[PDB]
Amino acid sequence: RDNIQGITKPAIRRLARRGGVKRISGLIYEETRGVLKVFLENVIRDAVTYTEHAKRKTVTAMDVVYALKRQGRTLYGFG
Amino acid sequence: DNIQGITKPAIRRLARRGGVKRISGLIYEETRGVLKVFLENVIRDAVTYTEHAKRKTVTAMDVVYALKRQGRTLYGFG
Amino acid sequence: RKESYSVYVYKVLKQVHPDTGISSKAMGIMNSFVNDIFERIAGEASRLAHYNKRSTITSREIQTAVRLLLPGELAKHAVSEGTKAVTKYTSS
Amino acid sequence: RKESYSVYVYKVLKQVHPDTGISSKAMGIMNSFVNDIFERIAGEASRLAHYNKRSTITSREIQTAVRLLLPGELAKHAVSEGTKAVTKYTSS
Amino acid sequence: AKSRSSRAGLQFPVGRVHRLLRKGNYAERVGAGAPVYLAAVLEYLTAEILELAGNAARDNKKTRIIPRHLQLAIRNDEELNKLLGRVTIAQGGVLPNIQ
Amino acid sequence: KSRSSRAGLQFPVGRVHRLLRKGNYAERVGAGAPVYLAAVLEYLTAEILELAGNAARDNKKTRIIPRHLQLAIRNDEELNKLLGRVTIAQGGVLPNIQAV
Amino acid sequence: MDETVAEFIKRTILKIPMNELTTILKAWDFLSENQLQTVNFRQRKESVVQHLIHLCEEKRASISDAALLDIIYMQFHQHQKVWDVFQMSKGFDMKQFKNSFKKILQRALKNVTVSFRETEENAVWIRIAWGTQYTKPNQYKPTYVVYYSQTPYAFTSSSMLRRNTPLLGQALTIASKHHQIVKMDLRSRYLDSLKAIVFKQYNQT
Amino acid sequence: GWLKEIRKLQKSTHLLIRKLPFSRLAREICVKFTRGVDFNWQAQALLALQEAAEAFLVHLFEDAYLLTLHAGRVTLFPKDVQLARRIRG
Amino acid sequence: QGWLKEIRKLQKSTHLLIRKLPFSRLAREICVKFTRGVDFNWQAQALLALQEAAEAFLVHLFEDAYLLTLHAGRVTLFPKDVQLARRIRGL
DNA sequence: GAGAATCCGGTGCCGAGGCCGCTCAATTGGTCGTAGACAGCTCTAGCACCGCTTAAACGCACGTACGCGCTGTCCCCCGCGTTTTAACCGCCAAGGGGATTACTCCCTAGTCTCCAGGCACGTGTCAGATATATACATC
DNA sequence: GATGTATATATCTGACACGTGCCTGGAGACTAGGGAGTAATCCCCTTGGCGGTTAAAACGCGGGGGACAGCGCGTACGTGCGTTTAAGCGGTGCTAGAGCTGTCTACGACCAATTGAGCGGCCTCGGCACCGGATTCTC
After folding, report:
1. Triad B55, B57, B60: Cα angle to 5°
2. Which of F65, G70, B49 is nearest to I35 (CA)?
3. Cβ–Cβ of C64/A66 closer than 8 Å?
4. Residue–nucleotide distance: C1 CA to J102 C1' (Å)
């Protein structure tokens, strides 16, 4: 019922430790849950378009790779 | 010289357009430095086009195309 | 002998405005605007003729390229206007 | 029926290294590397067939595209190696 | 004996866009209905940005469009600022922005 | 007699020429271009895989994994500017630690 | 109207072939035949449905009419799905049955969607769109029930969404005048074989 | 304290956000931008979304932490994250 | 005061904030160092084009780098600010 | 409670829009090959679910390491006035090469024909993964 | 000095490097016709310079404005630890959905005549840029 709290209170902590941050503040837990969401829209709205054009109800990996290439953040490892 | 033409009040007006209230003193070197490391990446990316179409003259379209490939699209001068 | 898009921008400006003149320099900007958007859309839709292994550019590919290359409300107005142009083009 | 570039990368790796194996995932990265650089250079040189009002892609346009798309020392080594390949291709 | 834009009900040309879209080598086959749609899209974009420019032109008690008016009409609107992000308009200047 | 072996290359030449015909890039494609293109691609592939194999060797493993390409790209200076807008799957980052 | 049902009607008519699309739209009985005369039936399918939606943009729309169109679409494509056979026991107008089933199902969960259609041999085709107590009902994975007033038998369509099967079974048993529901071995593709294997036994008990 | 935690996480390579919450989040956000239609993600593409999201967030928090050491802080406030997006554009 | 009038004045007009001939001599000096021996002709519009691009780039750089001086509580720029502003982008 | 900022008016000036000549490129029209929309069938791989189980998150109590406001000190940009200087304007010559046309020729494209290479499939088997157990590095 | 910190090996586990069959895309051949490379030319756009002015930059100076360093209170954050909840394995079912194989048809390249829509050159005249004047505003 929470639907964005699957991102947990320590998963953001694991991403901040990978980034190399010593001590997270408080309301970051309410901030990052915004930002990620916005970014996913500017992939998924950009990736549901290509699969709409090829008459396919299946969103393949190549569609997300093309959408990420069009955004500017090129992804290699899949295909 | 040929680099001191970008004087102190020139960089000062370039900063005062940008909303900067109070300016330090060392900026007047680093900005000149970054100005050079900008213009080089516009010059050779221009002049390769000039070396392709075998002419000794850099047209304005060559600089517009170099800035097109660089990322900062320029309008008007086409 | 070297064409441009000045006359058409002038006609659109005299359509949506009564007497607002435009200088000979700013009109040049409009040339490098609309020799640019046409480079994007009719470039990028060509890419959608390659991912789906086709060889044509119909109206549907240009429609999806407009859905991609524009932000939301402007894209909605553009896709609403373009098919309105096409439907009165078909029944000639 | 769906080709890739795995065999050739494997041959180059066994050439410049005696027995260094490569996993089946990282090889995929190499596919999306060299289906990408070929998209840049042989894309961008096509643009230089359009600014000079031509219709061909010879070796000179690919040479200038390599001079543009690569930083300095790597571009110098690449342009020094490519003509070395072409000259021993010509006298077949 | 009959114009293409007159069937299209538009103002931008149709045959010129079709000529560029064949000669540009974008695809080996060009559908007929495509450049009419594309010219209508270009007409709506130019109409939107000139409609936003003329209001700022009358705001400065002028009737002749200078590039500063186009700069302001791009940068004040939100969605055109999303579109024309990495573009430096020539002779343009910047917005009035303090602190 | 093959055009790969005639020029002394390893990357194919017929496949690159096939992708330059059917790629909608120009109306005519010369013969001196795709051999040059395959040579440049072979040089870049060798340039990556040398550093990747050396970083795999220094970690005492006889197999190349994407963390090794991540280290080889982000430690080299030229490929830092060539591949500066690239995310790599199963990537990881550099060991970055900094204090005040 | 909302901007969700238009995509559903467009997708449903895109699934319809051109061989009997005029038969579907005449049997659906929702638009005027002058507007059938207006629509070109000779261009391609990717604009005929645009013109038909633009007809339905103006006049009337719902989720119920789109659901009834979905029912008529499913009634002519019985070769696609695979059916299941139920039977009730331990124990009549159909209007009270419709009201009882709809009220019991809407009291069971929050969001459901029920649609009926009358067919001969006292048949009723019941489309059910399941949902949760927080989400919209999924229209694209329906569940179809062929129910007869005379026989206690009911034909059941399978779906992706299980876990509502005993809920639907008990709600339809309480919704009918019964107490028991069974689940036989009969799972096949064609409805006529199930019809024969039920009616050869029921008409000649 | 934390210093044994950073040097363990900048060594491994596995995913950090769990697969099923990220899948439910993607299936939530996707159904709003398609006019109420479900889809069927391939089991490969969700890995691509998750890898791009992890790379974007890690680069973002690196740049935000580069901002935090400028102002004398060590703590990463929400003033820092909403400023490292307007600079990058 | 004084600066409060100058920010209002310079953000209104759309002139060239850099003089012509020093910028032209700098561009020619940079162009000489690449592919030596020959000179290179410049059209009179191309140098104006490159000057407009350089002025727009530097103004955008200072306006972007100023926001990391209000953030630290300071008022004044520093070369740390400019180098960090280039570090954030990736140029 | 008066020098500074804003609006207004007059006058030169110069580019913006109207106008004509014209030419070449867009229109019209008839021909033919074929790209792709359309239908139907077939394998497959994604979703739903469930039982378990267990690894991690959750909630809390608490100690304390930074956040922040304050304040003292010292240095350091900005406004101002004077002197100096080079940028610019307009001109004048001249000449290097950019754009145009001709002309042959040559080099790539198309179609046909022949077969060697690169891909899918299948399989033993070594590389590492993780796990436990044991010899060094350290605040 | 106990807690990490690196190493030996256990074995076990599956990916992967490799071997084979095989379909089809790459090589050989050769004509042919447009692309273009070379040759000449003439103007046109750029370069160089004389000269005089006038804004514009450089340089001392002092003064307030701001950056920086210490510091005390305190509070918001890390950590330790029991619980409880949700995530993963994995297993079953099982069916919607990719895809791909024919077909036939509308449709877009391809081409000869032809003409007006749009491009090049020209000429004002009103819009505008600048210069000087009359009406507000904060220290």
Report:
1. 120
2. B49
3. no
4. 21
Residues 6+ apart with CB under 8 A from I81: I65, I66, I68, I69
- Name the E strands within chain C: 21-22
Which H or E element spans position C20? none
Q: How many helices (H) and strands (E) does chain D have?
A: 5, 2
Q: What is the DSSP letter of D58?
A: -
Helices (H), chain F: 3-6, 14-21, 33-58, 66-75, 78-82
Residue found by looking up tokens 């009900």 in the block: E9
The domain at C1-92 falls in which architecture? Orthogonal Bundle (1.10)
Q: Could you say which nucleotides of strand K lie within 7 A of any protein CB atom?
A: 4-5, 15-17, 25-28, 35-37, 45-47, 56-58, 65-68, 76-79, 86-88, 94-99, 107-109, 116-120, 127-129
Euclidean distance between CA atoms C48 and A51, whole angstroms: 11
The CA distance from F68 to F75, in Å, is 10
What angle is formed at CA A70 by the lines to CA A69 and CA A71, rounded to 5 degrees? 90
In CATH, what number is assigned to the domain containing residue E69? 1.10.20.10
Report yes or no: I11 and B20 within 8 Å, Cβ to Cβ. no
**B73 Cα to chain I: minimum distance (Å):** 9
Determine whether the interchain pair E87/B75 forms a contact, defined as Cβ–Cβ distance below 8 Å. Answer: yes
- Cβ contact (<8 Å) for A79 and D33? no
Assess whether chains G and E touch, using the rule of 3 or more C-beta pairs within 8 angstroms.
Answer: no
Radius of gyration of chain C (CA): 16
Candidates 3.40.50.300, 3.40.190.10, 3.30.70.270, 1.10.20.10; correct CATH number of I1-91? 1.10.20.10
**Bridging pattern class, strands G83-89 and G180-188:** antiparallel
Report the residue of D6, D10, D12 to disrupt the F interface, i.e. the one with the largest count of F CBs within 10 Å. Answer: D12
Q: Which run of H or of E encompasses G88?
A: strand G83-89
- Tokens representing F63 are 């197999």
Taking the C-alpha atoms of residue D32 and residue B58, their distance in angstroms, rounded to an integer, is 37
The whole-angstrom distance between E85's CA and the closest CA on chain B is 9
Q: Tell me the torsion sign for CA atoms I72, I78, I84, I85.
A: positive
Which chains touch A (3+ CB pairs under 8 A)? C, D, F, H
Amino acid at D48: L
Q: Which residues make Cβ contacts (< 8 Å) with residue D24, sequence separation at least 6?
A: none
To the nearest whole angstrom, how far is the Cα of B73 from the nearest Cα of chain C?
Answer: 10
What's the topology of domain H1-89? Histone, subunit A (1.10.20)
- Could you tell me the distance in Å between the CA of residue F46 and the C1' of nucleotide J120? 28
Tally of residues, chain H: 89
> How many domains are there within chain F?
1
- Which chain E residue lies closest to D56 (C-alpha atoms)? E25
Judge contact between D92 and F6, C-beta under 8 A: yes
Any bridge partners for residue G15, and if so which?
none
**Judging by beta carbons within 10 Å of its beta carbon (0-12, 13-18, 19+), is residue I78 exposed, middle or buried?**
buried
**Greatest Cα-to-Cα distance within chain H, rounded to the nearest angstrom:** 50
